Design goal:
Chain A: It comes from Thermus phage P74-26. Chain A: This is Major head protein. The PDB classes it as virus. The structure is cut from a larger assembly and holds two copies of chain A. The first copy, chain A, is built from two helices and no strands. The first copy, chain A, is mainly α. Chains A and B meet through loops of A and loops of B.
Amino acid sequence: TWSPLAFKESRVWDEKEILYLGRLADEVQAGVINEQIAESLTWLMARMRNR
Amino acid sequence: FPEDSTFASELELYLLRTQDAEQTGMTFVHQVGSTSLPVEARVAKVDLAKA
């Protein structure tokens, strides 16, 4: 007989850092979270390949 | 006052103010058969503040 294993995981972004963070050099009108989620979206794909 | 919109969560004010040199220093008194004399040294200065 043979039966598989399960593994999953999650990540959440709260309300402050969605609208409060920009770049560190210039002034930004709040669009860096869309940059930062898409990396974190790519990172969880690397988690499952690592597992 | 009327209303505006910034798309940013903080607003900073920088004020570069300059105190240039005034054009004083009238003219030296000469006579026709002699050599001139040099002009005094001026001062200019800058300053900048933050709110």
